[PDB]
Structure 1
Amino acid sequence: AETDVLIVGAGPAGAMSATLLASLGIRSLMINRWRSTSPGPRSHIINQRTMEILRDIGLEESAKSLAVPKEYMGEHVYATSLAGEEFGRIPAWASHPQAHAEHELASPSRYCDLPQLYFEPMVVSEAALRGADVRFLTEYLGHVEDQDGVTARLLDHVSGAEYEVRAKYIIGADGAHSLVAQNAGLPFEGQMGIGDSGSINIEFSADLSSLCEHRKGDMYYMFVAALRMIRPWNKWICVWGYEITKEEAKKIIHEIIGTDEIPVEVGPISTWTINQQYAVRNTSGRVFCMGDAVHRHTPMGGLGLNTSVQDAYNLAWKLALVLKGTAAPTLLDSYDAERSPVAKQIVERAFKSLSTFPPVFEALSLPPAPTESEMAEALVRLKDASEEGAKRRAALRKAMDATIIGLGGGHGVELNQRYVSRAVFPDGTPDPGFVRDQEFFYQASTRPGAHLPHVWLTENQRRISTLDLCGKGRFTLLTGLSGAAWKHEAEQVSQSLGIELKVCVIGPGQEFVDTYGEYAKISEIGESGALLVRPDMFIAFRAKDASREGLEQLNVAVKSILGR
């Protein structure tokens, strides 16, 4: 067997890698050890960046059809049981109107709930239909790198046969115990969170619409076990901290529903164990790891799947340009530089969220483990008509509010990627800062290294996002009428370098129109300046004006970005 890229792993990072490469005409073989995509929905939260990627490759409309919308997600209930009395609620998944506005402003896409159970086959299917070879029941066993490519050895769980694959690169998308990361010898750090422990996950079916429809929520937390909607509102899952459990789980569930009179049907029961670590480096020679393979962490914030897919989006177009000989192999160095700091920041963030929960119990004057008599008292203490009862209600409210960082509040974490690499050609301006907390709030930036900011233009008097002008596996140059020279400069650069760069001259009477003036407003530069946008939506070059010197630079920057 021979391919250009062997993709070990078929979860979110692998499938997306296969889909993007195929889209770019790169031959790839993607392998999974197991029979199917993943039996249970491990991750459900889809952030804006993932939706943006889905939009760019034309899969957002399917993702949207399938997924529960944002409006359903908002009501996060803390309570004793589902049918019991609430302690309080918090506006999760950006459902507070101010959060929602900040959310809407940051992207054309929105939060939805879409379980991995559904997300994966949707992407594996599209990988297959696009150029990509896909082969499950096939186990990566190891590989040996030489100067020209790699040779992987595979074990075929249908035939019993074993075989080799020759490839130019290997992507290690092989999950939380990446054998590909071991064999490439990737250093890992931040091993210690607390003592290693995970969770237990029980799927079930029951029609609790009568308890959910007035107060629609992605999750309901009981003091700590979580009830998470899989479909609204009949498919569910109970999660709690941590182990063999029988069809007694069915009592636990009843007690988590606070009532034993909805018919329940207990599905599968799985345990999730996490050792929290991030790879210091994600690349070794011809090997590139991504997804859980380089960042292993708590589910808090649901950053994993989303960061996993973004790893794939960073790498794909880079592999493709190198494979085609339009970019030097040095281009592949910026994968580690851009995407390695994201791996540490998200493991650290996901862990830090866990510490926002104890204060909820403290507010309740509760120990880490509480007797029901203990918990029943805390509820009484909470309806106390005294100033001490006030202080207490306020303390609980403050404690609850603080958990939001892990439940839709980390907009800054989701969006604020800053890239420093050879891939990103610096424009000479200093880094401006975040005016506000950079974990809670997205700050739009057009400085090289930042994601292209969203704003609405029109095409045929119809709204189109600045993002929809870009991507599609190519470089795009955005300017305005006074920067007409960019067209020509971009033509000469594209001929000489054998690369595709589309230029869009936004303005009145043009194909794309700055009809709300929001482009002029967000660009940070004169009408005649230009922004150059990577196939992965990131700005790699910024021009203040169309002046000759400004025009001359474009070539220097592209060459530099390509390693040429």
Structure 2
Amino acid sequence: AETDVLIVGAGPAGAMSATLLASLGIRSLMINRWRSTSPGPRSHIINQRTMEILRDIGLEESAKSLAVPKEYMGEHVYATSLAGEEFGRIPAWASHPQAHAEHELASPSRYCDLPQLYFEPMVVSEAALRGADVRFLTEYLGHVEDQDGVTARLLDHVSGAEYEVRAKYIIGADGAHSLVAQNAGLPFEGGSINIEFSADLSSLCEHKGDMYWMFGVAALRMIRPWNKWICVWGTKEEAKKIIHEIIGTDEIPVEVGPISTWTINQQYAVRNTSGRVFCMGDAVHRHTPMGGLGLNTSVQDAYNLAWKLALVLKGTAAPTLLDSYDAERSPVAKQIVERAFKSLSTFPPVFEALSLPPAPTESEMAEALVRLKDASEEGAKRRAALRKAMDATIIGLGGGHGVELNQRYVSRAVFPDGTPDPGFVRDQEFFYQASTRPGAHLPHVWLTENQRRISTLDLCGKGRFTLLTGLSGAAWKHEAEQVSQSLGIELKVCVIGPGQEFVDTYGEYAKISEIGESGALLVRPDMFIAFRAKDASREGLEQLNVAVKSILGR
């Protein structure tokens, strides 16, 4: 066999990599050891970044069709059991009107709930459709790197045959026990039971959290509303009884599905790249599910890498473009492993406000409910203490908008404009802050195209660089054309303004851009700003060719 990129693994990271590469016209072979996509719902929270990426590749509408929308995700309930009485509720997944505003303003996309069970075949199929070779029941065994490429040994679980594939690059998207990361010698620094069942819980959810949390803490998570379910906590037909005491009524017929377990050794790779091997997804960040960062960061790893491999494979970028994958994504790996872990400590204070031990008996828990309804000033302090504790759990339940969106890249693939880092006005984990400084994601605002709403993001992406400016920045069109033909790279210029293809109909682009109208923003295929000019002066214009060459390593 032979291919440009061997992608080991067909999870979210591998499948997205395959899809992106196949789109840019790069030959890839994506393999998977197992028969199918993941049989479990597993990760389910899709954040705005992943939806933006789906939007870019044309899959957002299908995703939205299958996904449960944001407004059926917000009603988070803390209770003894679902049919029982509830401690109280928190506005999960940005369902508070203020959080919702902040959500809406940050992206054209929105949170939704789309279990991996469904996300995966949607991306695996799109990858093969766009031109990726996809091969399941095929196991990566090892590889040898020379400085011309790589030779991997594969075991075929259908024919029993063992064969070699010659590639230029590997992508290790092979999950939390990546043999690819092990063979690349990547340095790393820094459990639960799931039960799928089926029961009509419509009556006791009609009147719309994405999750029910029962205090040992047991999560009742919506798979499909509201007939397919999953219980998760920190087994035989007893699992039925486990689903009965968590529902707090054995009155609904329950259909006990598959029972699995999930163990996690929380670590991140300090480096994600070794020679021609690039690792991504769970392979470089293993962590708790708090905040639902896993799948989303993994897909974003793929989006960062694919266009860079394509430019290098095409000879348009020097191979040093690829150094920026480690530079930009490794800090995200460490960040999310640390954040997901930190969120765990938001939970003991809930038990403590109850005046409970880590493991409460049934008499101890019923006693805490009593103390909670106590008409004394001490009862009041108790109710306030409980509320304060529950509120603090939001950081892992949709509160973490800043973590999700505030990527700040520093690398050779980002050309500094000379401004200092403005930092963040408010807490950078809770709150997204838009920035057009190179290294930040292009901000979303609405423009119009034929008086119909279009995002700044929809002007960009599609595997190419895009330059955004205004009418007084007309010279950018010519300058980008000279740079484009000399460097042999596509540079799409959009001049936003009255009477143009795209129009700053609400004035929001002028508002968000941070530069004069004649300034320009150069946006990477992955939606990150890589160059910013403040005006269309001679010196401003001349710097474009310098920045693009620099980004390309030429």
TM-score class normalised by the smaller sequence? over 0.9
1:346 aligns with 2:339: no
Deviations 1:234-274 (A, max 9, x none): 00000000xxx111100010000000000000000000000
Q: What residue number does 1:369 align with?
A: 359
Q: What residue number does 1:109 align with?
A: 109
Deviations 1:488-541 (A, max 9, x none): 000000000000000000000000000000000000000000000000000000
Once the 2 structures are TM-superposed, how far is the Cα of residue 17 of structure 1 from its aligned partner?
0.1
- Residue 68 of structure 2: SS of its match in structure 1? coil
Please, what TM-score do these two structures have when normalized by structure 2?
1.00
Deviations 1:318-365 (A, max 9, x none): 000000000000000000000000000000000000000000000000
- Residue 191 of structure 2: SS of its match in structure 1? strand
Equivalent of 1:266, from 256, 261, 282?
256
Once the 2 structures are TM-superposed, how far is the Cα of residue 392 of structure 1 from its aligned partner?
0.2
List 4+ stretches of structure 1 deviating above 2 A: none
| Mapped partners of 1:13, 1:446: distance in 2 | 27
- Residue 275 of structure 1: SS of its match in structure 2? coil
Once the 2 structures are TM-superposed, how far is the Cα of residue 227 of structure 1 from its aligned partner?
0.1
1:81 aligns with 2:81: yes
| Mapped partners of 1:302, 1:249: distance in 2 | 26
| Mapped partners of 2:150, 2:375: distance in 1 | 72
- Residue 6 of structure 2: SS of its match in structure 1? strand
| Mapped partners of 1:118, 1:181: distance in 2 | 27
1:465 aligns with 2:429: no
Q: What residue number does 1:217 align with?
A: 209
Once the 2 structures are TM-superposed, how far is the Cα of residue 304 of structure 1 from its aligned partner?
0.3
- Residue 55 of structure 2: SS of its match in structure 1? helix
For residues 126-275 of structure 1, the aligned pairs below 5 Å read: 126-189=126-189, 198-214=191-207, 216-223=208-215, 224-241=217-234, 245-275=235-265
1:553 aligns with 2:543: yes
Q: What residue number does 1:194 align with?
A: none
- Residue 479 of structure 1: SS of its match in structure 2? strand
Once the 2 structures are TM-superposed, how far is the Cα of residue 36 of structure 1 from its aligned partner?
0.1
Q: What residue number does 1:14 align with?
A: 14
| Mapped partners of 1:248, 1:371: distance in 2 | 19
- Residue 164 of structure 1: SS of its match in structure 2? strand
For residues 409-424 of structure 1, the aligned pairs below 5 Å read: 409-424=399-414
Once the 2 structures are TM-superposed, how far is the Cα of residue 147 of structure 1 from its aligned partner?
1.2
Once the 2 structures are TM-superposed, how far is the Cα of residue 179 of structure 1 from its aligned partner?
0.1
Once the 2 structures are TM-superposed, how far is the Cα of residue 75 of structure 1 from its aligned partner?
0.3
| Mapped partners of 2:242, 2:314: distance in 1 | 57
Once the 2 structures are TM-superposed, how far is the Cα of residue 553 of structure 1 from its aligned partner?
0.2
Deviations 1:19-66 (A, max 9, x none): 000000000000000000011111000000000000000000000000
Once the 2 structures are TM-superposed, how far is the Cα of residue 413 of structure 1 from its aligned partner?
0.2
- Residue 58 of structure 2: SS of its match in structure 1? coil
Q: Which runs of 5+ in 1 are unaligned?
A: 190-196
Q: What residue number does 1:193 align with?
A: none
| Mapped partners of 1:433, 1:252: distance in 2 | 48
| Mapped partners of 1:445, 1:109: distance in 2 | 18
Once the 2 structures are TM-superposed, how far is the Cα of residue 459 of structure 1 from its aligned partner?
0.2
Deviations 1:276-331 (A, max 9, x none): 00000000000000000000000000000000000000000000000000000000
- Residue 168 of structure 2: SS of its match in structure 1? strand
- Residue 391 of structure 1: SS of its match in structure 2? helix
Deviations 1:56-91 (A, max 9, x none): 000000000000000000000000000000100000
1:66 aligns with 2:63: no
Deviations 1:179-222 (A, max 9, x none): 00000000000xxxxxxx900000000000000010x1100000
| Mapped partners of 2:103, 2:38: distance in 1 | 30
- Residue 308 of structure 2: SS of its match in structure 1? helix
| Mapped partners of 1:477, 1:269: distance in 2 | 51
| Mapped partners of 2:278, 2:521: distance in 1 | 29
Q: What residue number does 1:322 align with?
A: 312
| Mapped partners of 1:102, 1:130: distance in 2 | 35
| Mapped partners of 2:134, 2:239: distance in 1 | 37
| Mapped partners of 1:199, 1:328: distance in 2 | 45
| Mapped partners of 1:152, 1:12: distance in 2 | 22
Deviations 1:361-388 (A, max 9, x none): 0000000011100000000000000100
| Mapped partners of 1:462, 1:151: distance in 2 | 51
Once the 2 structures are TM-superposed, how far is the Cα of residue 396 of structure 1 from its aligned partner?
0.1
| Mapped partners of 1:103, 1:246: distance in 2 | 43
| Mapped partners of 1:403, 1:217: distance in 2 | 15
Deviations 1:420-458 (A, max 9, x none): 000000000000010000000000000000000000000
For residues 374-389 of structure 1, the aligned pairs below 5 Å read: 374-389=364-379
| Mapped partners of 1:163, 1:247: distance in 2 | 44
| Mapped partners of 1:326, 1:336: distance in 2 | 20
| Mapped partners of 1:39, 1:476: distance in 2 | 39
- Residue 274 of structure 1: SS of its match in structure 2? coil
Once the 2 structures are TM-superposed, how far is the Cα of residue 169 of structure 1 from its aligned partner?
0.1
- Residue 391 of structure 2: SS of its match in structure 1? helix
Q: What residue number does 1:192 align with?
A: none
Deviations 1:131-166 (A, max 9, x none): 100000000000000010000000000000000000
| Mapped partners of 1:135, 1:304: distance in 2 | 24
**RMSD of the alignment, in Å?**
0.7
Identical aligned pairs, as a percentage?
100
| Mapped partners of 1:296, 1:514: distance in 2 | 42
- Residue 266 of structure 1: SS of its match in structure 2? strand
| Mapped partners of 1:426, 1:92: distance in 2 | 37
- Residue 341 of structure 1: SS of its match in structure 2? helix
| Mapped partners of 1:45, 1:140: distance in 2 | 29
- Residue 2 of structure 1: SS of its match in structure 2? coil
Deviations 1:462-502 (A, max 9, x none): 00000000000000000000000000000000000000000
- Residue 3 of structure 2: SS of its match in structure 1? strand
Please, what TM-score do these two structures have when normalized by structure 1?
0.98
| Mapped partners of 2:368, 2:147: distance in 1 | 67
Size of the aligned set, in residue pairs, is 553
- Residue 213 of structure 1: SS of its match in structure 2? coil
Q: What residue number does 1:443 align with?
A: 433
| Mapped partners of 1:280, 1:527: distance in 2 | 41
Deviations 1:103-123 (A, max 9, x none): 000000000000000000000
| Mapped partners of 1:280, 1:159: distance in 2 | 38
| Mapped partners of 1:370, 1:518: distance in 2 | 53
